[PDB]
């Protein structure tokens, strides 16, 4: 699915942007946007990836 791949690329880009951020609120907003994009893609795997990214970002940045 091309749409799924594009959504995955966008999710990874958002995760990369969040990883190099200093304000945890900005990272939370980016992760919320990524979760919304994953929900729009209708793929459980993308939701799982977003959930894991949230955990990793919250641990490392927070």
């Amino acid at each position, epitope marked *: 699915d091309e749409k799924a791949k594009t959504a995955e690329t966008l999710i990874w880009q958002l995760f990369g942007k969040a990883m190099q951020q200093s304000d945890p609120n900005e990272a939370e907003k980016l992760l919320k946007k990524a979760e919304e994009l994953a929900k729009k893609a209708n793929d459980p795997r993308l939701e*799982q990836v977003v959930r894991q990214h949230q955990v990793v970002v919250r641990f490392l940045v927070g």
Partner: antibody
């Protein structure tokens, strides 16, 4: 191409010197994983040394491996460097650079390993 | 401190065409907060780098033959080979990633019995 990591050849050193080992990655997007280092001593267990994140370059070491060891990156050439200072006789071992994942947290791709031997 | 992994047995003599079992035991609970249990099994052959065999207790990595199986929970985990072959000899060890830092077991060596 085949996903792989390439490391330099064996090293023979004398105490008090400094060594530098390189690890070059090929076959994937270098900025979407983490680079972990593992040390294997003869007749002992594998020991996690630390990991470096490609996004910011900030390394993380275990307590035992602080001070004398250094991690560095060359993103343009897709290379990771491990630098060791003030060598001893206890540093004779084999070093692996491995790729670590962000979703399942395993080490799936391993390098061939570089042997470092220190003796006078 | 660091989680301690103990493997049983240290040397396992097995014969081609039979089943083998290896046990890994942690010092504490490996169940992560989010719900998944991160226990992985690696295999190393003489003169080569280790290769991943199993990830997250019982899943199978791509390319691994179907005869490998994993099971367990809590602090007891087990790997089972239904039909050993000549290419399955080596050193197997477990690892965890649920508590910083990851640690590796001592390793069990498989050899032919006579």
């Amino acid at each position: 191409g085949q996903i792989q990591l390439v490391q330099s050849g064996p090293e023979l050193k004398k105490p008090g010197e400094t060594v530098k080992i390189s690890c070059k990655a090929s076959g994937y997007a270098f900025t979407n994983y983490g680079v972990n280092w593992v040390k294997e001593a003869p007749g002992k267990e594998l020991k996690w040394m630390g990991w470096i994140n490609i996004y910011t370059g900030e390394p993380t070491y275990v307590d035992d491996f602080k001070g004398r060891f250094a991690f560095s990156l060359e993103t343009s050439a897709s290379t990771a460097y491990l630098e060791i200072n003030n060598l001893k006789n206890e540093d004779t071992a084999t070093y692996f650079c491995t790729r670590g994942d962000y979703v399942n947290w395993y080490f799936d791709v391993w390098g061939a390993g570089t042997t470092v031997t220190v003796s006078s | 401190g660091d989680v301690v992994m103990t493997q049983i047995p240290l040397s396992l003599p097995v014969s081609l065409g039979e089943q083998a079992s290896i046990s890994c035991r942690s010092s504490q609970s490996l169940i992560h907060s989010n719900g998944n249990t991160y226990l992985h099994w690696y295999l190393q052959k003489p003169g080569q780098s280790p290769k991943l065999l199993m990830y997250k207790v019982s899943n199978r990595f791509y390319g691994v033959p179907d005869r490998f199986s994993g099971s367990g929970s809590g602090t007891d985990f087990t790997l089972k080979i239904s039909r050993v072959e000549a290419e399955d000899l080596g050193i197997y060890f477990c690892s965890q990633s649920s508590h910083v830092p990851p640690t590796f077991g001592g390793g069990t060596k498989l050899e032919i019995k006579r």
